[PDB]
Design a protein around this ligand. Structure first.
Ligand SMILES: CC(C)(COP(=O)(O)OP(=O)(O)OC[C@H]1O[C@@H](n2cnc3c(N)ncnc32)[C@H](O)[C@@H]1OP(=O)(O)O)[C@@H](O)C(=O)NCCC(=O)NCCS
Ligand SMILES: CC(C)(COP(=O)(O)OP(=O)(O)OC[C@H]1O[C@@H](n2cnc3c(N)ncnc32)[C@H](O)[C@@H]1OP(=O)(O)O)[C@@H](O)C(=O)NCCC(=O)NCCS
Lengths: 152, 152
């Protein structure tokens, strides 16, 4: 029960595949565990300045993970970080794991001169909504999906 | 009134600064026109595979612009495109400009193997909401902002 948090680098594709499994198990979409990208693709993601993979380790086991994207802005020299997925092992809930990964993300943001971190949640994901409401400021917005298949 | 649409490259920082002015004027935030990043920063954005700047030209004038981010996914070898800003000159509305830039974005998505394009709107931006409702599928969601200043 000694938890370590870190940002994965491209030497850690093995721990990254294990974070992928955590997502699949926790979101029900094992979508995450078959059809995983090959090792070069994962390595290339971990090499980018614009993708942030964070993990919490129990021993060598991955018990929490967070994937976020850095969005370098165009109107001004500044950045925003967008949390895409965040999961914690079911056997490890209510132990501060999600909060520690978010805390590490803030340290990553500060190093990047990113001025805000933001994350989105569906109506009904009450854990998610409770966590983010404790940690940040809620706004409500609309999302639209567009199919590129219809290009003309 | 011959409109041309294209994706800017790093040789076109001049047209990109003009797209920045269109945003500032159209969103009221001229935030967009002072404090612009320097030319290397803009050039580096235009060099990335992960940032998409699209513009519509009347002569040499920029009359529409769209900034989007490609999000290479981690669970699977695939991508999503996230439209950040989209603006059209006030003297050029109701002429198909926004729709053409979105159409070009779909061609960019198809070339990238991106499978979806998505965009967000505030309750009350009825042009935006009407455009996106004609073009895609609305969902409603929550957004939370987190201040990295509080890292511990
Ligand atoms: C939400 C989740 C990240 C929680 O992780 P966690 O380590 O157990 O959270 P932490 O221990 O650091 O922080 C707990 C805080 O989150 C909130 N919360 C967490 N789980 C909750 C739950 N099951 N029910 C209600 N509120 C919850 C609370 O606000 C809580 O604060 P508190 O203990 O002071 O009341 C995750 O375990 C989960 O259950 N599902 C993943 C879904 C998700 O987060 N986002 C959508 C997937 S991308
Ligand atoms: C919204 C905006 C992109 C419209 O651009 P446009 O070139 O005039 O749009 P197009 O001519 O290609 O397409 C028109 C469609 O958009 C919708 N629409 C566009 N402007 C509208 C308006 N002012 N009022 C109501 N609906 C509008 C309609 O659905 C319309 O379809 P229709 O002509 O068949 O009824 C832009 O000009 C604007 O007014 N404000 C920018 C705000 C924004 O788009 N997003 C938030 C900023 S990031």
């Amino acid at each position: 029960g000694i938890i370590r948090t870190c940002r994965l680098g491209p030497d850690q594709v093995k721990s990254m595949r294990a974070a992928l499994d955590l997502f699949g198990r926790e979101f029900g979409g094992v979508t995450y565990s078959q059809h995983q990208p090959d090792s070069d693709y994962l390595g290339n993601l971990l090499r980018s300045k614009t993708f942030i993979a964070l993990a919490a380790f129990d021993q060598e086991a991955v018990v929490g993970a967070l994937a976020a994207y850095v969005l370098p802005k165009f109107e001004q020299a500044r950045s925003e970080i967008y949390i895409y997925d965040l999961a914690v092992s079911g056997e490890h809930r209510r132990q501060g794991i999600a909060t520690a990964l978010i805390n590490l993300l803030k340290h990553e943001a500060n190093a990047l001169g990113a001025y805000v971190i933001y994350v989105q949640a569906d109506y009904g994901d009450d854990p998610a909504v409770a966590l983010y409401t404790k940690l940040g400021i809620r706004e409500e917005v609309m999302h639209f999906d567009i199919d590129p298949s219809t290009a003309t």
